[PDB]
Amino acid sequence: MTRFLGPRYRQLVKNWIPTAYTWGAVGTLGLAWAADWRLILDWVP
Amino acid sequence: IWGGYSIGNPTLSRFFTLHFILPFIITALTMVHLLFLHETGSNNPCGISSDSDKI
Amino acid sequence: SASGKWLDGIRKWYYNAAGFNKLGLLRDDTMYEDEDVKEAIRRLPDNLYNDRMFRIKRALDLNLKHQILPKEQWTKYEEENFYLEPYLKEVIRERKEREEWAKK
Amino acid sequence: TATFAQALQFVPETQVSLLDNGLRVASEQSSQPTCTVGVWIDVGSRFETEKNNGAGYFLEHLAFKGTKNRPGSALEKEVESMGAHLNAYSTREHTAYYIKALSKDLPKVVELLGDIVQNCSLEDSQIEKERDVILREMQENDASMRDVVFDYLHATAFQGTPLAQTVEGPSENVRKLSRADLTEYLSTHYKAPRMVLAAAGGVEHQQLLDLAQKHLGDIPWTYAEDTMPALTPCRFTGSEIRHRDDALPFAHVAIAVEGPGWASPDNVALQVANAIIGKLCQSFQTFSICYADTGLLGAHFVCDRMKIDDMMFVLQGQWMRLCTSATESEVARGKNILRNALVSHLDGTTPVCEDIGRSLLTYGRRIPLAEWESRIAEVDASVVREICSKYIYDQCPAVAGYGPIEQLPDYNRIRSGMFWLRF
Amino acid sequence: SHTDVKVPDFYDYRRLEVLDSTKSSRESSEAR
Amino acid sequence: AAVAFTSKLYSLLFRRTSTFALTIVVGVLFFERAFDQGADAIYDHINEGKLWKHIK
Amino acid sequence: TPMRKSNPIMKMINHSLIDLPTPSNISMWWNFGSLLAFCLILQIITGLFLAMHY
Ligand SMILES: CCCCCCCCCCCCCCCCCC(=O)OC[C@H](COP(=O)([O-])OCC(O)COP(=O)([O-])OC[C@@H](COC(=O)CCCCCCCCCCCCCCCCC)OC(=O)CCCCCCCCCCCCCCCCC)OC(=O)CCCCCCCCCCCCCCCCC
Ligand SMILES: CCCCCCCCCCCCCCCCCC(=O)OC[C@H](COP(=O)([O-])OCC(O)COP(=O)([O-])OC[C@@H](COC(=O)CCCCCCCCCCCCCCCCC)OC(=O)CCCCCCCCCCCCCCCCC)OC(=O)CCCCCCCCCCCCCCCCC
Ligand SMILES: CCCCCCCCCCCCCCCCCC(=O)OC[C@H](COP(=O)([O-])OCC[N+](C)(C)C)OC(=O)CCCCCCCCCCCCCCCCC
Numbered sequence: 076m077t078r079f080l081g082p083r084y085r086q087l088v089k090n091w092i093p094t095a096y097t098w099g100a101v102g103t104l105g106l107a108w109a110a111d112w113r114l115i116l117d118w119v120p
Numbered sequence: 121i122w123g124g125y126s127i128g129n130p131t132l133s134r135f136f137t138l139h140f141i142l143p144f145i146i147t148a149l150t151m152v153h154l155l156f157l158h159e160t161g162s163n164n165p166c167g168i169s170s171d172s173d174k175i
Numbered sequence: 176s177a178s179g180k181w182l183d184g185i186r187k188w189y190y191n192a193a194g195f196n197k198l199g200l201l202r203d204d205t206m207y208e209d210e211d212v213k214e215a216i217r218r219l220p221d222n223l224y225n226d227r228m229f230r231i232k233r234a235l236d237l238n239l240k241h242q243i244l245p246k247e248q249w250t251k252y253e254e255e256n257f258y259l260e261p262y263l264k265e266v267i268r269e270r271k272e273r274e275e276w277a278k279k
Numbered sequence: 280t281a282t283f284a285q286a287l288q289f290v291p292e293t294q295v296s297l298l299d300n301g302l303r304v305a306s307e308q309s310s311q312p313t314c315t316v317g318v319w320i321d322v323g324s325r326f327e328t329e330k331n332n333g334a335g336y337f338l339e340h341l342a343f344k345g346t347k348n349r350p351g352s353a354l355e356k357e358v359e360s361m362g363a364h365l366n367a368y369s370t371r372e373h374t375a376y377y378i379k380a381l382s383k384d385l386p387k388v389v390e391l392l393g394d395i396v397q398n399c400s401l402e403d404s405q406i407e408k409e410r411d412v413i414l415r416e417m418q419e420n421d422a423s424m425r426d427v428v429f430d431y432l433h434a435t436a437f438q439g440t441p442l443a444q445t446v447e448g449p450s451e452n453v454r455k456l457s458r459a460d461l462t463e464y465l466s467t468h469y470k471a472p473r474m475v476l477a478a479a480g481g482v483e484h485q486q487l488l489d490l491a492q493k494h495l496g497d498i499p500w501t502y503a504e505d506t507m508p509a510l511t512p513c514r515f516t517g518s519e520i521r522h523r524d525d526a527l528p529f530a531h532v533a534i535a536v537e538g539p540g541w542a543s544p545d546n547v548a549l550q551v552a553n554a555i556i557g558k559l560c561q562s563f564q565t566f567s568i569c570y571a572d573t574g575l576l577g578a579h580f581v582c583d584r585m586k587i588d589d590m591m592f593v594l595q596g597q598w599m600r601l602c603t604s605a606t607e608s609e610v611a612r613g614k615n616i617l618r619n620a621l622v623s624h625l626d627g628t629t630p631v632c633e634d635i636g637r638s639l640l641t642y643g644r645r646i647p648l649a650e651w652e653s654r655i656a657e658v659d660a661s662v663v664r665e666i667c668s669k670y671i672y673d674q675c676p677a678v679a680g681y682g683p684i685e686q687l688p689d690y691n692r693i694r695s696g697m698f699w700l701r702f
Numbered sequence: 703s704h705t706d707v708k709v710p711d712f713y714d715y716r717r718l719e720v721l722d723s724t725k726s727s728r729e730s731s732e733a734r
Numbered sequence: 735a736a737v738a739f740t741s742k743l744y745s746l747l748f749r750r751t752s753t754f755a756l757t758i759v760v761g762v763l764f765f766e767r768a769f770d771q772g773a774d775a776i777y778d779h780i781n782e783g784k785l786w787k788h789i790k
Numbered sequence: 791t792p793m794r795k796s797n798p799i800m801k802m803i804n805h806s807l808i809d810l811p812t813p814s815n816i817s818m819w820w821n822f823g824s825l826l827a828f829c830l831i832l833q834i835i836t837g838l839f840l841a842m843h844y
């Protein structure tokens with residue numbers, strides 16, 4: 076591409092990072108809850 | 121997928137149910153395929169636009 | 176230096192092998208119409224536009240009839256006209272400028 | 280050579296003083312042969328009850344029609360023989376009377392200006408003539424569609440509160456208002472500590488103050504019996520008003536949320552946001568309308584009837600964009616647009632005089648351009664993100680529409696556009 | 703013309719959560 | 735003024751859609767277990783003496 | 791209008807394979823899609839019959 080190297084794109088990515096890792100948390104916990112994945116669920120009190 | 125410890129009677133009925141149902145999914149997806157095609161029209165051997173000589 | 180004559184030699188060979196000249200077509204006729212090419216075609220003056228359209232229809236008719244022009248009428252490598260290149264270069268410059276604005 | 284900000288230091292100061300009755304006198308001297316002088320009054324439609332809604336507009340119609348000292352057209356003839364101009368206006372929240380004149384005429388100007396606000400001759404004949412004129416002026420559809428939709432917006436947003444009501448008032452009232460009502464209105468609201476005497480141009484401050492004591496110092500200041508009317512506190516409602524008429528050429532639409540008011544700092548940042556936003560349709564604008572404790576923050580547009588939905592989509596999408604994804608590069612542009620606007624507005628004496636008056640009523644003080652520049656310089660993309668989120672994101676709007684508005688989206692569809700599911 | 707406009711009263715339908723007014727507006731919004 | 739419960743709940747959890755979704759998965763994890771245990775208790779209690787788990 | 795264009799089902803058929811604009815110059819290599827469809831139909835029919843004895 077080579078187009079998307081520059082200041083605006085860096086700023087724009089920083090704007091969306093938090094939402095990204097929050098959706099990541101949602102997906103991970105959901106997968107674990109759905110497949111009764113003991114590797115993660117054994118650590119939940 | 122076997123339904124048991126090995127290939128056996130429970131697997132053959134699965135093969136047969138799936139072989140029965142798939143062709144019709146193929147039919148539906150063929151209709152979608154042509155729907156997509158008719159929005160643009162057919163390419164041709166020369167690779168240049170044919171809108172001056174459509175029949 | 177000689178290297179120019181040598182490169183032009185292979186280029187002429189490749190041109191005759193391609194064979195769009197047998198159909199009476201110029202090189203700039205044979206481009207695929209992406210976005211930039213369509214915008215360059217929009218910018219042509221009327222005479223060039225009409226000449227292009229007829230040339231293309233004629234090639235299509237010949238292809239329909241599995242035939243080619245007489246050898247006397249083939250497009251020759253040494254007297255061809257790249258009529259579309261200038262307009263295309265301007266279109267591409269404009270798009271590049273806009274991209275470059277978009278990253279600041 | 281200077282910098283912009285350094286040029287802002289050369290702008291002269293605004294001097295302010297008080298009389299004994301609490302009237303404040305304010306001036307900016309600019310060494311010119313021409314001047315503007317006015318009185319600004321802290322009264323408007325949001326202090327009227329449904330019994331006398333429309334009184335101030337009535338009073339404005341016969342303000343310049345005669346005083347005891349100058350019966351009838353004598354006042355008009357004396358203004359016109361100086362070559363001066365005389366104007367007035369009335370708002371949801373303020374009132375103003377001013378004069379444009381030569382600097383040579385300041386003693387007469389102030390004199391006339393004091394004669395007008397204390398000694399209008401409310402004669403029955405003139406009252407009835409104004410009554411007929413206002414009724415005639417209301418009978419036919421003499422209103423622009425823009426005014427119609429903005430009045431509708433105030434009515435739906437501030438329903439059950441005094442700000443919903445219009446400046447002109449209903450026709451039922453103008454055919455029924457009496458001289459007693461007019462004189463009671465004046466006696467109750469036109470008190471010295473609510474008034475400002477403002478001047479700009481070739482005016483010296485101490486001369487203006489002497490003339491003010493001579494011609495305005497007898498205005499009373501004792502509010503009596505707390506005769507001032509009791510009224511309902513502020514509230515904003517998310518709601519819609521729809522007036523359908525498929526014969527009008529084009530659809531008019533206005534949509535706001537609630538703004539913070541005059542006093543808050545946040546206004547600056549919001550303005551920047553506005554400048555960033557402002558094709559589909561013919562005409563489009565963004566706006567902020569401030570009051571003492573509340574306001575409207577939104578947009579207005581005109582469309583062909585088949586392109587209302589797309590336009591609403593585009594507008595709400597830009598809002599969500601600013602709340603979630605703003606960047607520095609655009610913010611810089613908006614700040615520059617705002618700088619240019621502020622400095623462009625204050626050209627000539629009239630706007631400057633007007634700014635002095637409005638400022639002393641709303642802020643208690645003149646805010647110099649240097650302070651505005653310092654406030655503008657602090658905004659950045661993070662501030663814009665924060666404050667836009669603080670006032671726009673997931674809020675219930677007020678909507679008004681007039682025209683062929685079948686395609687104006689349903690209220691639930693509009694409310695769901697105030698938030699993103701991917702955030 | 704238009705100036706005679708007035709929305710009719712909705713008292714019957716509105717929530718008590720705003721009628722019990724001893725709390726800033728936007729905080730109420732949040733509760734609802 | 736009045737920090738009230740549902741307002742804190744809106745502002746902390748429900749205002750942002752990702753966090754709303756996360757709240758939902760976390761609630762279902764614990765609801766499932768509590769609800770199962772209660773139901774099994776009731777069931778077992780309705781017909782004590784007749785289930786082979788205890789006769790065993 | 792002709793009935794060819796009076797009705798959604800008919801007008802879709804018409805836009806599909808009566809008044810569709812096709813290139814004049816396409817060759818035999820473009821016949822194999824219709825043959826594919828034919829083959830699918832043949833397979834479904836012969837299969838439904840076999841099914842009743844297997
Ligand atoms: C069966 C019985 C039938 C009969 C019943 C009878 C009764 C029926 C009555 C009821 C009838 C209802 C009719 C429908 C009403 C629809 C209304 C509507 O469309 O409103 C438009 C509504 C109005 O807004 P608008 O005015 O159009 O404005 C548009 C703006 O852009 C607005 O912008 P915005 O940002 O606000 O919203 C945009 C965004 C808002 O949404 C979001 O951002 C997220 C929303 C919540 C999270 C959902 C995430 C789902 C992700 C996919 C599944 C994986 C989950 C995790 C597990 C991973 C496993 C590996 O949504 C989208 O962009 C759409 C896609 C969102 C999902 C992304 C994934 C797309 C691919 C899906 C297929 C994936 C298959 C492979 C999966 C992996 C391998 C197994 O706006 C929408 O765009 C609504 C979006 C609705 C999306 C629904 C998605 C459902 C499908 C989920 C996945 C299914 C496959 C799962 C496979 C197994 C793995 C789990
Ligand atoms: C016991 C079983 C009995 C079975 C009996 C079977 C009987 C079958 C009868 C079939 C009759 C078909 C009639 C169709 C009429 C259609 C008319 C039409 O419009 O056509 C347009 C169509 C052409 O379409 P187009 O629009 O021009 O577009 C095509 C291209 O785009 C155009 O591009 P281009 O112009 O650039 O191309 C020019 C050139 C391109 O030329 C080249 O690329 C160069 C070729 C050079 C070849 C040189 C010789 C070989 C290589 C030697 C090299 C040296 C080796 C050195 C070794 C050194 C070792 C040390 O290509 C041609 O001109 C090709 C023409 C010939 C086509 C042949 C088709 C064969 C079909 C076979 C069917 C087999 C299955 C039958 C059923 C079996 C059941 C068990 O076809 C024609 O124009 C020709 C029509 C006449 C074809 C007759 C075929 C007869 C086949 C009989 C087979 C019998 C034996 C079966 C054995 C089975 C064994 C299991
Ligand atoms: C592949 C198999 C395993 C898959 C496991 C899946 C893991 C992830 C599960 C996530 C569940 C919760 C997602 C909530 C998302 C809400 C988004 C939204 O728009 O909400 C607001 C919307 C609209 O709300 P609203 O309009 O009132 O207001 C929303 C406004 N905000 C966000 C500001 C508050 O609410 C909905 O209507 C959402 C309904 C969601 C229904 C989901 C049903 C459960 C389906 C998944 C569970 C079952 C899996 C079974 C697997 C079996 C495997 C063997």
Ligand SMILES: CCCCCCCC/C=C/CCCCCCCC(=O)OC[C@H](COP(=O)(O)OCCN)OC(=O)CCCCCCC/C=C/CCCCCCCC
Pocket residue numbers: 792793794
């Ligand atoms: C008893 C033994 C069996 C006897 C069988 C007898 C029938 C034999 C086969 C006859 C086939 C039909 C031929 C005549 C078709 C006439 C169609 C017609 O008139 O409609 C044309 C006209 C065209 O439309 P436009 O383009 O808009 O016209 C505008 C012109 N400017 O109308 C249409 O759109 C077509 C309408 C089609 C109607 C077809 C009716 C078919 C009737 C079949 C009956 C079969 C009975 C079998 C009985 C078996 C024993 C119980």
Ligand code: HEM
Pocket residue numbers: 146150153157161162163164819820821822823824826827830
């Ligand atoms: C059951 C399988 C399929 C059926 C029934 C089918 C059917 C068709 C038909 C009828 C056409 C009309 C034009 C023509 O005949 O050339 C077509 C075009 C086309 N098919 Fe399919 N097809 C199938 C599989 C595929 C596959 C496997 C591919 C590619 C990997 C494909 C790609 C295309 C493309 C690109 C075109 C249009 C190309 C052009 O017009 O130049 N199809 N198909």
Ligand code: HEM
Pocket residue numbers: 139140143830833834835836837838840841844
């Ligand atoms: C794309 C469509 C289809 C394909 C490619 C296909 C392919 C095949 C093939 C290769 C065989 C084995 C041939 C042999 O053993 O000699 C077979 C068998 C069979 N198919 Fe089809 N088939 C299709 C559609 C269908 C459909 C729709 C049915 C509906 C019931 C069906 C029913 C059967 C049956 C019952 C058999 C076993 C009979 C036998 O082996 O002769 N098929 N199929």
Ligand SMILES: O=C1C(=C2CCC(c3ccc(Cl)cc3)CC2)C(O)=C(O)c2ccccc21
Pocket residue numbers: 154157162806807812820823824827828
């Ligand atoms: O054969 C087709 C074709 C179609 C004709 C009708 C066929 C068909 C198949 C089965 C039935 Cl029951 C009816 C019609 C399907 C393919 C189609 O849509 C095109 O667009 C096309 C373009 C170029 C060359 C050939 C074709």
